[PDB]
PQR file with spaces between the fields and no chain letter, atoms N, CA, C, O and H, PARSE charges and radii, in Angstrom:
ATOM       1  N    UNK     1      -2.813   -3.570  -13.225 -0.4000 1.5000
ATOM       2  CA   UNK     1      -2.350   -2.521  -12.327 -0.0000 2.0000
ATOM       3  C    UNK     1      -3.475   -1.538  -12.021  0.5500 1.7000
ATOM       4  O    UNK     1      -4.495   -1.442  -12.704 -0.5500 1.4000
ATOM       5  N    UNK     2      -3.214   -0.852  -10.986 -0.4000 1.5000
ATOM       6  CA   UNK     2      -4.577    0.114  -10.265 -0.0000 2.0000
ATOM       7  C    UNK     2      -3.704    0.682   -9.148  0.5500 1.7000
ATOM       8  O    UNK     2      -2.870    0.179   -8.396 -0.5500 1.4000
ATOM       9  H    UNK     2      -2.386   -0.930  -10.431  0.4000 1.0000
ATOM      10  N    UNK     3      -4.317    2.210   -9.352 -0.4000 1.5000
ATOM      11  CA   UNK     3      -3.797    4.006   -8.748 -0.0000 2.0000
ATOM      12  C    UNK     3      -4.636    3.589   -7.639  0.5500 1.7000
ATOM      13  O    UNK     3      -5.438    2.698   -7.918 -0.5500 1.4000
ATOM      14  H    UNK     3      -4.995    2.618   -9.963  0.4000 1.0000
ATOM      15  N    UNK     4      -4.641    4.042   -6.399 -0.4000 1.5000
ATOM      16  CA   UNK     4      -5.555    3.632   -4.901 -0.0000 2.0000
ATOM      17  C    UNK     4      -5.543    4.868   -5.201  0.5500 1.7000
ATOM      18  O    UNK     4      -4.528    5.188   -5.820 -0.5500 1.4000
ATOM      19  H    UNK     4      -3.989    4.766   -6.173  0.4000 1.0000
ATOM      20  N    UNK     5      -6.715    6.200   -4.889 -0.4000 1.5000
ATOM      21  CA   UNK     5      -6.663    7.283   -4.695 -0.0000 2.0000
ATOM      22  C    UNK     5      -8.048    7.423   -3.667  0.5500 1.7000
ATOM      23  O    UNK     5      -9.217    7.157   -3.944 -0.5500 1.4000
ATOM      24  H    UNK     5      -7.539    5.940   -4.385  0.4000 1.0000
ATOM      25  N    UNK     6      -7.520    7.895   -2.498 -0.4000 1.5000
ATOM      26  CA   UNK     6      -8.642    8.250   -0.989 -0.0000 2.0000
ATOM      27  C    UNK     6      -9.676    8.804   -1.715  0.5500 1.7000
ATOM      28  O    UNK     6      -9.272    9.772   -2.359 -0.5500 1.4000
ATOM      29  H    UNK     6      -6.570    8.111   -2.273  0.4000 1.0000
ATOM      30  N    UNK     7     -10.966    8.552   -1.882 -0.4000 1.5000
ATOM      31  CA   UNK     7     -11.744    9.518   -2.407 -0.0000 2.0000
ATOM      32  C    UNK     7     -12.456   10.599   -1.431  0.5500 1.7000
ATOM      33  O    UNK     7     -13.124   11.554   -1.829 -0.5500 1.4000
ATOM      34  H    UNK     7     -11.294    7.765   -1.358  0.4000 1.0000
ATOM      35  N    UNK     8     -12.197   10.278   -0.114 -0.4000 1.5000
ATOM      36  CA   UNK     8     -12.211   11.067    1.107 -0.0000 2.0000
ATOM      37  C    UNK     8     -11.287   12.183    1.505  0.5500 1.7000
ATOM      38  O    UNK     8     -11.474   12.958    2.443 -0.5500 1.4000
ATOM      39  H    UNK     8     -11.655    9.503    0.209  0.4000 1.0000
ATOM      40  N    UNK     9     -10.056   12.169    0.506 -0.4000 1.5000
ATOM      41  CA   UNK     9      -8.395   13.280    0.239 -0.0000 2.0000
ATOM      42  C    UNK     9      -8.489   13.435   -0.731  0.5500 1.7000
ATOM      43  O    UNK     9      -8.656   14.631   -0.971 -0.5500 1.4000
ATOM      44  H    UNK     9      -9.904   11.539   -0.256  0.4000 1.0000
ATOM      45  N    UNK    10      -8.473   12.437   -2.104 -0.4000 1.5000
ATOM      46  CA   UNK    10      -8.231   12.622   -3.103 -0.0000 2.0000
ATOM      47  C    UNK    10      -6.112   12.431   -3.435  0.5500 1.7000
ATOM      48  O    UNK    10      -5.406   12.787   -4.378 -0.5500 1.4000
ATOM      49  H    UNK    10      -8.337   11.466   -1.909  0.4000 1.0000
ATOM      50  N    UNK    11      -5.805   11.723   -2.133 -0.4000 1.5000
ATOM      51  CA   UNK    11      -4.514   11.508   -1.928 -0.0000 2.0000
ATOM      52  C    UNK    11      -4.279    9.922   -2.159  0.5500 1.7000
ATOM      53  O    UNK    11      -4.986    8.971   -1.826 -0.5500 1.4000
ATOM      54  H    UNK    11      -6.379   11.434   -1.367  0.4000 1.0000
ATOM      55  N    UNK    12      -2.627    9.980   -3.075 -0.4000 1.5000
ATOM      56  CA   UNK    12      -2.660    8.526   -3.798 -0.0000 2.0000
ATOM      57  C    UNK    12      -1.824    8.120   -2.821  0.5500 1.7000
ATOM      58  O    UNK    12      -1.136    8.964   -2.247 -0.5500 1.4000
ATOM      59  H    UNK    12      -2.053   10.753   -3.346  0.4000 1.0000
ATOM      60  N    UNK    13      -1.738    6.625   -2.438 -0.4000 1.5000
ATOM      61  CA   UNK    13      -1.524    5.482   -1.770 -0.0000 2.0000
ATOM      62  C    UNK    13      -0.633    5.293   -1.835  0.5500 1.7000
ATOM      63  O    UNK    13      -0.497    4.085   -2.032 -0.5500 1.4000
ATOM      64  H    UNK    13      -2.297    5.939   -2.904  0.4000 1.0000
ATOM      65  N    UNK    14       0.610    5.982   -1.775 -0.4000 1.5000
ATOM      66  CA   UNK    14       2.252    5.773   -1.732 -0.0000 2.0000
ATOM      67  C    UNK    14       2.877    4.357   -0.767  0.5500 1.7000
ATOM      68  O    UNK    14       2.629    4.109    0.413 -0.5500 1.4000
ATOM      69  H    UNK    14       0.500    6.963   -1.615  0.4000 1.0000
ATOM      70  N    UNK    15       3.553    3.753   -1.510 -0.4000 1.5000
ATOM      71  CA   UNK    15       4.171    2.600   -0.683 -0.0000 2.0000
ATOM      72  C    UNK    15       5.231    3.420   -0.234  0.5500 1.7000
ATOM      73  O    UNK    15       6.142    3.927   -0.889 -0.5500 1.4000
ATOM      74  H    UNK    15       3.755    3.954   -2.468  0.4000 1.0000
ATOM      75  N    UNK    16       4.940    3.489    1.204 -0.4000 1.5000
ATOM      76  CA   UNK    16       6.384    4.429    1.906 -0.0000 2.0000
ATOM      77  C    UNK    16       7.213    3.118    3.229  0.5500 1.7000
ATOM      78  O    UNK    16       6.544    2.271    3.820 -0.5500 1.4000
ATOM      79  H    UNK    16       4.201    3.077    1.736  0.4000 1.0000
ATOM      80  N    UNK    17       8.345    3.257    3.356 -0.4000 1.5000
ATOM      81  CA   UNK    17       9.587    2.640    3.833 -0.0000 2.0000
ATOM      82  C    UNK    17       9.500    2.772    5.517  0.5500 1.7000
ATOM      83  O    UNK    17      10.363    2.352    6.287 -0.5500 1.4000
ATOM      84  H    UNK    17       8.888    3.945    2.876  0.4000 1.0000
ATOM      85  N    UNK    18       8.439    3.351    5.841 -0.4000 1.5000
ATOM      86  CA   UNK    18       8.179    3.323    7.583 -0.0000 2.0000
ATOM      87  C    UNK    18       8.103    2.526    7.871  0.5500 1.7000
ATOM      88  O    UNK    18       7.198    1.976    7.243 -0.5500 1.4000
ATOM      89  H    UNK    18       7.737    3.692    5.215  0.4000 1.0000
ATOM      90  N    UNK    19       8.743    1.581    8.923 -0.4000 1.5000
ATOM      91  CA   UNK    19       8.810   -0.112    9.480 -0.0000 2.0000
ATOM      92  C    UNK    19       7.823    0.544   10.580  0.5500 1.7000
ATOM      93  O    UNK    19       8.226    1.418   11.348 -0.5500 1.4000
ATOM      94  H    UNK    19       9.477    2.028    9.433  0.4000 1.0000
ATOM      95  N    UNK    20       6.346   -0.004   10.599 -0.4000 1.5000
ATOM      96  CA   UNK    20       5.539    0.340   11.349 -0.0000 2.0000
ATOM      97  C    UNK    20       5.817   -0.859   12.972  0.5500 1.7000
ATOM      98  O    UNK    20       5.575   -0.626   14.156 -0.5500 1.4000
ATOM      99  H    UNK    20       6.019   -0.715    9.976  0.4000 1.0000
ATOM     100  N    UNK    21       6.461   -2.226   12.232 -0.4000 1.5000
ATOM     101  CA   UNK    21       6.779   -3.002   13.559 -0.0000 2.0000
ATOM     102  C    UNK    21       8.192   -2.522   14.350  0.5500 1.7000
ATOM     103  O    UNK    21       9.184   -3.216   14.574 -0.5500 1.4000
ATOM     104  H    UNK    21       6.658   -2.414   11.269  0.4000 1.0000
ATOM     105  N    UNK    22       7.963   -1.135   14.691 -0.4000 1.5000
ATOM     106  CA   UNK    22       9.664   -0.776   14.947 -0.0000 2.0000
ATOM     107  C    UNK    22      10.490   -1.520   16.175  0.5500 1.7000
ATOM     108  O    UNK    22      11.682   -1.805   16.291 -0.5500 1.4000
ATOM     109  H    UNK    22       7.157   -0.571   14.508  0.4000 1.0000
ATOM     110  N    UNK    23       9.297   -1.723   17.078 -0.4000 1.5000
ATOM     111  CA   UNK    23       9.153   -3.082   18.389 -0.0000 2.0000
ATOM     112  C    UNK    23      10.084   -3.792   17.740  0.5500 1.7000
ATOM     113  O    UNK    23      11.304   -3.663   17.636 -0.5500 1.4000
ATOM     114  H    UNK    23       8.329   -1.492   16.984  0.4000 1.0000
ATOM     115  N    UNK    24       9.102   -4.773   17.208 -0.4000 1.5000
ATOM     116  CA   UNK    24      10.457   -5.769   16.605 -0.0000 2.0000
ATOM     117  C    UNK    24      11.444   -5.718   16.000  0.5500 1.7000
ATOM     118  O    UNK    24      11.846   -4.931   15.143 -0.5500 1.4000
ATOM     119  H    UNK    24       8.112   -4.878   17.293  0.4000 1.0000
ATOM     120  N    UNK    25      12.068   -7.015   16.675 -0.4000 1.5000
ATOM     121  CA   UNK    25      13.769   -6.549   16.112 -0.0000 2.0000
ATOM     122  C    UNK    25      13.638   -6.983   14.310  0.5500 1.7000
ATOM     123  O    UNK    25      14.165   -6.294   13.437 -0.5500 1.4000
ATOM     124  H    UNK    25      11.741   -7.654   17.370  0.4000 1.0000
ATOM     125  N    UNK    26      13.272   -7.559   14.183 -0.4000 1.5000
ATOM     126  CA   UNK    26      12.845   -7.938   12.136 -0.0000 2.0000
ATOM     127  C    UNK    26      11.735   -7.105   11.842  0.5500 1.7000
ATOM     128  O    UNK    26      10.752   -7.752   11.482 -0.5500 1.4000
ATOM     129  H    UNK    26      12.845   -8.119   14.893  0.4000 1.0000
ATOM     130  N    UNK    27      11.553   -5.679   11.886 -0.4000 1.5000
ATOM     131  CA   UNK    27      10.024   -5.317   11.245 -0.0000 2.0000
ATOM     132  C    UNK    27       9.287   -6.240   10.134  0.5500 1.7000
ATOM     133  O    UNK    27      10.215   -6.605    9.412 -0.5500 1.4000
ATOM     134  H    UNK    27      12.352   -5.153   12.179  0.4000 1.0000
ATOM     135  N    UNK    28       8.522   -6.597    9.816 -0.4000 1.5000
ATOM     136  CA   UNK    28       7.940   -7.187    8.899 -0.0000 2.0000
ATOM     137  C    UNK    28       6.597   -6.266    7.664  0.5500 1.7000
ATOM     138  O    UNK    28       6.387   -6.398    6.458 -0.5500 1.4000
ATOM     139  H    UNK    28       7.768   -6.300   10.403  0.4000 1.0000
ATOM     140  N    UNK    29       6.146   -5.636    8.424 -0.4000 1.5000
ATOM     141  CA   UNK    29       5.180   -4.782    7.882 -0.0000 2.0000
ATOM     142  C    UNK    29       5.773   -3.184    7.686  0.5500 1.7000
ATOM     143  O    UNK    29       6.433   -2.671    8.589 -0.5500 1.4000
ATOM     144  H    UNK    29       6.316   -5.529    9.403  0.4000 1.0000
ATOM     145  N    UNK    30       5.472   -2.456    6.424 -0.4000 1.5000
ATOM     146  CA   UNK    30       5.581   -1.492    6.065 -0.0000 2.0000
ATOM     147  C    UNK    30       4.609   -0.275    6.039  0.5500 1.7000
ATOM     148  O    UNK    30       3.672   -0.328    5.243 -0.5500 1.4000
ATOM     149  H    UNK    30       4.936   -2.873    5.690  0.4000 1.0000
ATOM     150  N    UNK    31       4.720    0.581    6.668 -0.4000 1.5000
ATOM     151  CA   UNK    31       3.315    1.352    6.492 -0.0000 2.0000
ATOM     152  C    UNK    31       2.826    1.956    5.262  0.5500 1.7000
ATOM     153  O    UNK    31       3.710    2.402    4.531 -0.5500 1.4000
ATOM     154  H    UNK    31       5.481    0.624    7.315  0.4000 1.0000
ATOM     155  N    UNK    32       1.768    2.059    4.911 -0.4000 1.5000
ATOM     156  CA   UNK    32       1.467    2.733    3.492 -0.0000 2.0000
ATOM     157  C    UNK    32       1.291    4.419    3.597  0.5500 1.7000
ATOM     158  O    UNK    32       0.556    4.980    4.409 -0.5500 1.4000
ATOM     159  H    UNK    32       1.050    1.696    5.505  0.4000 1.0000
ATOM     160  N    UNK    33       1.969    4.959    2.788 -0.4000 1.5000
ATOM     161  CA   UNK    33       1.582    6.635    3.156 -0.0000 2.0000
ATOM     162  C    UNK    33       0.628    7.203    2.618  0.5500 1.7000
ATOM     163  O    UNK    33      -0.325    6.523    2.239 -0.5500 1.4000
ATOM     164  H    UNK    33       2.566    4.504    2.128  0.4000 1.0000
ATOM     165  N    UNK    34       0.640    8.618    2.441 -0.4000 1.5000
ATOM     166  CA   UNK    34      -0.255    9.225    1.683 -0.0000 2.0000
ATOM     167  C    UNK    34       0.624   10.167    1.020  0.5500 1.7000
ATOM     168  O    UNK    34       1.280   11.037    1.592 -0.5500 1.4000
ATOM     169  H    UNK    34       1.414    9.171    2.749  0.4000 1.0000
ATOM     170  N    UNK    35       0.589    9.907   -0.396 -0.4000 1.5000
ATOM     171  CA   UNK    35       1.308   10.782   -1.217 -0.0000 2.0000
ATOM     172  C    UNK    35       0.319   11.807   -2.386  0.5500 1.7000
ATOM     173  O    UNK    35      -0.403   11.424   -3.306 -0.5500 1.4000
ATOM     174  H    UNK    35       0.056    9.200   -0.861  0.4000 1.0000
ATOM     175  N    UNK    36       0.634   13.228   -1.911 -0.4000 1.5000
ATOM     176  CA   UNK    36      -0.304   14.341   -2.479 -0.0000 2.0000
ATOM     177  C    UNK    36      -0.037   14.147   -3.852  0.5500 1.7000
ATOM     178  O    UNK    36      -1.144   13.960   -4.357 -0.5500 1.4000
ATOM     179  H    UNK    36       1.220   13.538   -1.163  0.4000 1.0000
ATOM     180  N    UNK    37       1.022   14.077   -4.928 -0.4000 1.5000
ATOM     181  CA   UNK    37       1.029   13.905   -5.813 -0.0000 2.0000
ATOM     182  C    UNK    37       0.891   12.526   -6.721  0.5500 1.7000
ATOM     183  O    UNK    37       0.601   11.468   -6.162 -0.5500 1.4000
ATOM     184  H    UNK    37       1.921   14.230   -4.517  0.4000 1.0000
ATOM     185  N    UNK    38       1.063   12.578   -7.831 -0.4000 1.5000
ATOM     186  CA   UNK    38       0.428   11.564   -8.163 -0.0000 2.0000
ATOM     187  C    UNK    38       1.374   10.570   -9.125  0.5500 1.7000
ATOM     188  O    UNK    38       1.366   10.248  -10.313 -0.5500 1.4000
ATOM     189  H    UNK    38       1.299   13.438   -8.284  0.4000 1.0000
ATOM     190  N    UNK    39       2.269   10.235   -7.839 -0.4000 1.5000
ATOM     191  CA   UNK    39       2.985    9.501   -8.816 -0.0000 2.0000
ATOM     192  C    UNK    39       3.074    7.717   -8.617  0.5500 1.7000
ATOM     193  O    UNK    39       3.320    6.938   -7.696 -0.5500 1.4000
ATOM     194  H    UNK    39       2.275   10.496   -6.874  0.4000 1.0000
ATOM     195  N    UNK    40       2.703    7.629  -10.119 -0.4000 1.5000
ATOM     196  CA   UNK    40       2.746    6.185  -10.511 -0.0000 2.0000
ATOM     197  C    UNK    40       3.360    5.557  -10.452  0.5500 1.7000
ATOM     198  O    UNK    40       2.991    4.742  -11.298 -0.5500 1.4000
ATOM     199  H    UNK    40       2.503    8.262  -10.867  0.4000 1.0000
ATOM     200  N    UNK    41       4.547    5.058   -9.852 -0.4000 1.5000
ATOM     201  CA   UNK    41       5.544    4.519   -9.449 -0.0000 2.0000
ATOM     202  C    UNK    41       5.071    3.165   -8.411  0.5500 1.7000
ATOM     203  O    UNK    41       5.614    2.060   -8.391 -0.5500 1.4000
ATOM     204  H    UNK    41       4.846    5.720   -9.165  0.4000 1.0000
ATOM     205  N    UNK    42       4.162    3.520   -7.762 -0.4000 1.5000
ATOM     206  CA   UNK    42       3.916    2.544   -6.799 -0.0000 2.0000
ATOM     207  C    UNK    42       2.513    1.836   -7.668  0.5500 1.7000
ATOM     208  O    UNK    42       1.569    2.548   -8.011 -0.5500 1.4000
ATOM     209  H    UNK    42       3.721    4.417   -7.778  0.4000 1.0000
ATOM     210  N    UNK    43       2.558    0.377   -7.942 -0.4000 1.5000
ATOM     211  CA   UNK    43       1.777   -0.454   -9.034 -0.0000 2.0000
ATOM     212  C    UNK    43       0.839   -1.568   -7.951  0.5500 1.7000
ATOM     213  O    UNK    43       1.155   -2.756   -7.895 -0.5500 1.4000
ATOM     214  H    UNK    43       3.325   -0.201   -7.664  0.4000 1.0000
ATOM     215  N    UNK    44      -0.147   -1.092   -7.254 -0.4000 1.5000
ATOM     216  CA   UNK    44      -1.200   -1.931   -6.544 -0.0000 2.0000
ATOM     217  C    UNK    44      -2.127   -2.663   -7.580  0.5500 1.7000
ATOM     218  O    UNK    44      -3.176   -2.274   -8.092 -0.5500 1.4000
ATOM     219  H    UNK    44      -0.403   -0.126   -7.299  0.4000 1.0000
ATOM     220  N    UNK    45      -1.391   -3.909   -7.748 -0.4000 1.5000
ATOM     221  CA   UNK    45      -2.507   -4.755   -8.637 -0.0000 2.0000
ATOM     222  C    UNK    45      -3.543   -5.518   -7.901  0.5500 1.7000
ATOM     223  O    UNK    45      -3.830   -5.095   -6.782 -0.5500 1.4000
ATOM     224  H    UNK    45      -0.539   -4.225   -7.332  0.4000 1.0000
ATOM     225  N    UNK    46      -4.074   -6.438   -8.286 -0.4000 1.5000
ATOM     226  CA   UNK    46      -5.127   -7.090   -8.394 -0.0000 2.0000
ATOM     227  C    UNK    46      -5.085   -8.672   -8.405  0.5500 1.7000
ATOM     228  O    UNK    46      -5.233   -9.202   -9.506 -0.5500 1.4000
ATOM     229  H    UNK    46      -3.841   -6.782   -9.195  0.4000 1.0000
ATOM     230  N    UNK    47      -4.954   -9.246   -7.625 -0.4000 1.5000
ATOM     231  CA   UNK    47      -4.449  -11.099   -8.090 -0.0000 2.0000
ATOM     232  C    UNK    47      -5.561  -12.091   -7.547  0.5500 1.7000
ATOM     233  O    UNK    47      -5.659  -12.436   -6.369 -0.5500 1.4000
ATOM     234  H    UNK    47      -4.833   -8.816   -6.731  0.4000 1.0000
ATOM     235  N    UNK    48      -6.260  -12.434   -8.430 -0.4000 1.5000
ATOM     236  CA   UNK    48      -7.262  -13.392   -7.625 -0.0000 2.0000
ATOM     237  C    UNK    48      -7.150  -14.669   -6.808  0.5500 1.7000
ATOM     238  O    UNK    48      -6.682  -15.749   -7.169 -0.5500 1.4000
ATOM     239  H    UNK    48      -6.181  -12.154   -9.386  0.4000 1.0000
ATOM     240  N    UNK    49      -7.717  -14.304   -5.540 -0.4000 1.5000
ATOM     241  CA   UNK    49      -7.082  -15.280   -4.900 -0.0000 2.0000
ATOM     242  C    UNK    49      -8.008  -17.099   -5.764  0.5500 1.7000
ATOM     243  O    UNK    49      -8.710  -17.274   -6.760 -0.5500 1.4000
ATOM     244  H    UNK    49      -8.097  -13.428   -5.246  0.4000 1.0000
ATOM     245  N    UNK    50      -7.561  -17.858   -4.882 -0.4000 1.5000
ATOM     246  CA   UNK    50      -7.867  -19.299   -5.447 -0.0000 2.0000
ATOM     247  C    UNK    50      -9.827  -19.439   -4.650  0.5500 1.7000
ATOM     248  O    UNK    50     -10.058  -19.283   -3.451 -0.5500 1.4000
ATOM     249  H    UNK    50      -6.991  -17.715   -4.073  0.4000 1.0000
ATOM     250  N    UNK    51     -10.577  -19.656   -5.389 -0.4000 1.5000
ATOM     251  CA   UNK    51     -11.817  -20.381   -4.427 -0.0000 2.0000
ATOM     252  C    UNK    51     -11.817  -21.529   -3.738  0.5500 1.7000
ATOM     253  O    UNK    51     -12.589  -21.747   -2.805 -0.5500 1.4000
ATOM     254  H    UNK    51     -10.389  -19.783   -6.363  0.4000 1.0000
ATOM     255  N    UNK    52     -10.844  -22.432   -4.209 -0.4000 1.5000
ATOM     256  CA   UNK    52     -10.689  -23.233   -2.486 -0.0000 2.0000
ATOM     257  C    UNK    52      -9.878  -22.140   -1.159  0.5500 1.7000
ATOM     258  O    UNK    52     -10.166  -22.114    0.038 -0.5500 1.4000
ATOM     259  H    UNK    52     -10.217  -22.255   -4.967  0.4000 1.0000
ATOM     260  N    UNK    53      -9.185  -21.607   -1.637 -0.4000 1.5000
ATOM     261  CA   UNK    53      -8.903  -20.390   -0.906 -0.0000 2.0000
ATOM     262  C    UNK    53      -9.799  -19.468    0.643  0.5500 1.7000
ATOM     263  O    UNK    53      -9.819  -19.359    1.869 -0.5500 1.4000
ATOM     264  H    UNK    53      -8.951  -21.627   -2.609  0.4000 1.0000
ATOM     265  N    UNK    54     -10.519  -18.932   -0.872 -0.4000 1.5000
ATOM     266  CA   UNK    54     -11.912  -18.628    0.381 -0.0000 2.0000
ATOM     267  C    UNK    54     -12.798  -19.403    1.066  0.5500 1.7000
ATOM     268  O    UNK    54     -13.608  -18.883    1.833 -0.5500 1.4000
ATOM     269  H    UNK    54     -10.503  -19.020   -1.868  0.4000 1.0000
């Protein structure tokens, strides 16, 4: 697990519920916010992708 924090704000990387595809009738994508405080709740890990992959 890993905190995203802007080092340009110093603001953490909140997974927020804005359907950024509002166009479409199925949004698919979520926008990411910016949350001033610092809460850990939202868990941005790390998963390596496969090297036949890349």
């Amino acid at each position: 697990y890993v905190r995203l924090r802007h080092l340009c704000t110093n603001t953490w990387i909140q997974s927020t519920n804005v359907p950024i595809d509002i166009e479409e009738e199925r949004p698919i994508r979520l926008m990411l916010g910016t949350c001033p405080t610092k809460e850990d709740k939202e868990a941005f890990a790390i998963v390596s992708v496969p090297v036949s992959e890349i």
